[PDB]
Design a protein around this ligand. Structure first.
Ligand SMILES: *[C@@H]1O[C@H](CO)[C@@H](O)[C@H](O)[C@H]1NC(C)=O
Ligand SMILES: *[C@@H]1O[C@H](CO)[C@@H](O)[C@H](O)[C@H]1NC(C)=O
Ligand SMILES: *[C@@H]1O[C@H](CO)[C@@H](O)[C@H](O)[C@H]1NC(C)=O
Ligand SMILES: *[C@@H]1O[C@H](CO)[C@@H](O)[C@H](O)[C@H]1NC(C)=O
Ligand SMILES: *[C@@H]1O[C@H](CO)[C@@H](O)[C@H](O)[C@H]1NC(C)=O
Ligand SMILES: *[C@@H]1O[C@H](CO)[C@@H](O)[C@H](O)[C@H]1NC(C)=O
Ligand SMILES: *[C@@H]1O[C@H](CO)[C@@H](O)[C@H](O)[C@H]1NC(C)=O
Ligand SMILES: *[C@@H]1O[C@H](CO)[C@@H](O)[C@H](O)[C@H]1NC(C)=O
Lengths: 279, 49, 296
């Protein structure tokens, strides 16, 4: 059950600036109205971020993985349906699969004989139905290291809203053999810009996996050459170890941050443990 | 006033340093090792403080 | 005048041992009695979670030969709740049973299994000559005889690549300064001490990052309030008075340090209540006296 696919508008990468995005709670313990200073993997402020589209046009290449990655994707009808993670993706090394079924996302840590151009084949059908008979993800599952089923959330899978209300963020830290997911969603009424402003990123789940990943690719619904898919975009940022000043609020939410290596002014802010400096 | 309150905070945060020990809480190391082997760890904390 | 002496304190009154709810026993026994034990290069891995483990059966039993705990004391090992437990199982020759120690040198301790200096777990060894020795030789077990670069702690190496002893290219299935990475253990009953096979298991663990799940005797009592008591919510012993607080934890919050390092307001097991902690009242007594020559 593999069908190749190159019905893409081949385009070179587009770029954008990652202003103040990618701030997640470092540890589970709680603090309030204090300025803790910690160093960890993050997405450095003001960095170039790779851009791909999705509608004609079809962006789905394979991108490398290293020291985590920050995946964000604006969406209407949230065409994105899953990811893949692995070193070889040929039923040779343990591979990670996260299939978000409308019903619920099931974590399949099993070696998988993938396709050369895999994707969720959900049938282009234009009669108020999207019946799926194209399970075009893998071919063989000889052994499963792990298996899990999440909460049965049913998120909206239709719409052509003028402003992409849905804006979902994720981040995928793979350290000490544990997999981590921190996510947040916010309705947005702007049209294009990777939003300017600040937010946080709560955790959702952590997994014991103990697998070696260097490569990954997203998965999404879709006939092969022919479909009715709305506008969709997703940016990818590569993480980096840095140090931060995190200003918790009395409520307990991470309200603002300051980098410790961006520019000398920020470095003095980092040293003095204050958000303001007198002359 | 700032200088005096500067000292206490620098003094208080010193209570959260390994000083070479394997932890920074006495109740922890007391409830995590037998009697004969705790003294060597506790020594490093006392001389540090 | 006035003199400052012998500061006073409130005494505590009772104890609180509220642990999380009791679940089943851990299936470690079948691990420590598995049909077969994986070889050293590809040491078997087992994860322990969602069970209650009583270490008395494992410890008091003479079923073992050599026992040693490093970061903990096995006497009170049954009173600290662990976030996770690793059950690493393999069989080696009894000669190198000292190489298991963290920061040791040796062919097994350098090439195909390494430990960190701060390995917090406990290590058990148990002689296995009768069943693991084969009258013809238990050659099922191999080992990484040579490695290009000694591996970091807890990284399994599975390649069967032919060794390169020299800079000259290695060619064919075998070649000049080419050798198989693995050499088979011989295990026969004729062997003496140190030569006979051993079943060795190590039990590392990790602390406090997430609410722990493995525990021992639970004996949760109550949530008495405004009483100087000795609380032991999960293995964080401490004293003081427990009050209700209008504070709020997000669904993934306990252990509010809340200023610098103090275990301030904390949630509880058995239920979900955001409590608070304040140490019992303290102060330094002082005696004001006229001259003892005058009056007493
Ligand atoms: C990064 O983006 C800027 C535009 O913001 C562009 O001028 C520059 O060439 C980009 N650099 C890279 C890494 O392509
Ligand atoms: C998810 O969707 C795929 C493709 O339709 C299907 O094979 C699989 O059984 C589904 N799993 C769940 C949890 O429904
Ligand atoms: C999958 O891996 C296991 C070892 O974990 C192995 O025994 C098995 O042969 C592999 N493939 C199959 C057929 O399940
Ligand atoms: C992961 O795989 C890569 C590519 O084969 C290898 O270079 C690296 O050493 C591996 N790392 C681990 C932790 O196994
Ligand atoms: C913080 O808590 C107060 C009191 O409950 C509430 O009025 C306010 O809206 C909260 N703010 C945030 C950031 O949630
Ligand atoms: C769980 O805890 C509650 C409150 O202590 C108790 O009433 C209940 O019986 C417990 N259930 C189990 C699984 O022991
Ligand atoms: C294995 O089984 C025997 C049965 O007599 C028992 O004595 C021994 O303690 C068991 N070993 C372990 C710890 O699994
Ligand atoms: C006792 O000693 C005090 C000084 O402490 C002195 O003033 C006083 O005159 C002495 N005589 C008396 C009244 O006992």
């Amino acid at each position: 059950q593999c069908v190749n696919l190159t019905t893409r508008t081949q385009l070179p990468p587009a770029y954008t600036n990652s202003f103040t995005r990618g701030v997640y709670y470092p540890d589970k313990v709680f603090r309030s109205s204090v300025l803790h200073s910690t160093q960890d993997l993050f997405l450095p402020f003001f960095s170039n971020v790779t851009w791909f589209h999705a509608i004609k046009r079809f962006d789905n290449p394979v991108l490398p993985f290293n020291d985590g990655v920050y995946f964000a994707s604006t969406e209407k009808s949230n065409i994105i349906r899953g990811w893949i993670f692995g070193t070889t993706l040929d039923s040779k090394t343990q591979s990670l699969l996260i299939v978000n079924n409308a019903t619920n996302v099931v974590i399949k840590v099993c070696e998988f004989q993938f396709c050369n151009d895999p994707f969720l084949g959900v049938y282009h059908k234009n009669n108020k139905s999207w019946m799926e008979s194209e399970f075009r993800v893998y071919s063989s599952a000889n052994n499963c290291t792990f298996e899990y089923v999440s909460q049965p959330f049913l998120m909206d899978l239709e719409g052509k809203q003028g402003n992409f209300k849905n804006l979902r963020e994720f981040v995928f830290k793979n350290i000490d053999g544990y997999f981590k997911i921190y996510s947040k969603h916010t309705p947005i009424n702007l049209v294009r810009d990777l939003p300017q402003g600040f937010s946080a990123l709560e955790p959702l789940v952590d997994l014991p996996i103990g697998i070696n990943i260097t490569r990954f690719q997203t998965l999404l619904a879709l006939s092969s050459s022919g479909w009715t898919a709305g506008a969709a975009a997703y940016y990818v940022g590569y993480l980096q170890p840095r140090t931060f000043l995190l200003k918790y609020n009395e409520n307990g939410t991470i309200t603002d941050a300051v980098d410790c290596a961006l520019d000398p002014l920020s470095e003095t802010k980092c040293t003095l443990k204050s958000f303001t400096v007198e002359k | 006033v700032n200088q005096n309150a500067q000292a206490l905070n620098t003094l208080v945060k010193q209570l959260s340093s390994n000083f070479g020990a394997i932890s920074s809480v006495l109740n922890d190391i007391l409830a995590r090792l037998d009697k004969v082997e705790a003294e060597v760890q506790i020594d490093r904390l006392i001389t540090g403080r | 005048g006035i003199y400052q002496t012998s500061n006073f304190r409130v005494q505590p009154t009772e104890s609180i041992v509220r642990f999380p709810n009791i679940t089943n026993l851990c299936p470690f026994g079948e691990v420590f009695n598995a049909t077969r034990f994986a070889s050293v290069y590809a040491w078997n891995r087992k994860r322990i979670s969602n069970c209650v483990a009583d270490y008395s059966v494992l410890y008091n039993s003479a079923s073992f030969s050599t026992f040693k705990c490093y970061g903990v004391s096995p006497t009170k090992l049954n009173d600290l709740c662990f976030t996770n437990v690793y059950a690493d199982s393999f069989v080696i020759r009894g000669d190198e049973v000292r190489q298991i120690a963290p920061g040791q040198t040796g062919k097994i301790a350098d090439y195909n299994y390494k430990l960190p200096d701060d390995f917090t777990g406990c290590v058990i060894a148990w002689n296995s000559n009768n069943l693991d020795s084969k009258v013809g030789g238990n050659y099922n077990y191999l080992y990484r005889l040579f490695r290009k670069s000694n591996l970091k702690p807890f990284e399994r190496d599975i390649s069967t690549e032919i060794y390169q002893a020299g800079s000259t290219p290695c060619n064919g299935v075998e070649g000049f300064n080419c050798y198989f990475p693995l050499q088979s253990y011989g295990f026969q009953p004729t062997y003496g001490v140190g030569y006979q096979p051993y079943r060795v298991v190590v039990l590392s663990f990790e602390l406090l990052h997430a609410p722990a799940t493995v525990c021992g005797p639970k004996k949760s009592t109550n949530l008495v309030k405004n009483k100087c008591v000795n609380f032991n919510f999960n293995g964080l012993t401490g004293t003081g008075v427990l009050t209700e607080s209008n504070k709020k934890f997000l669904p993934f919050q306990q252990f509010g340090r809340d200023i610098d390092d103090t275990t301030d307001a904390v949630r509880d097991p058995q239920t979900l209540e955001i409590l608070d902690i304040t140490p019992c009242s303290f102060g330094g007594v002082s005696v004001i006296t006229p001259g003892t020559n005058t009056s007493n």
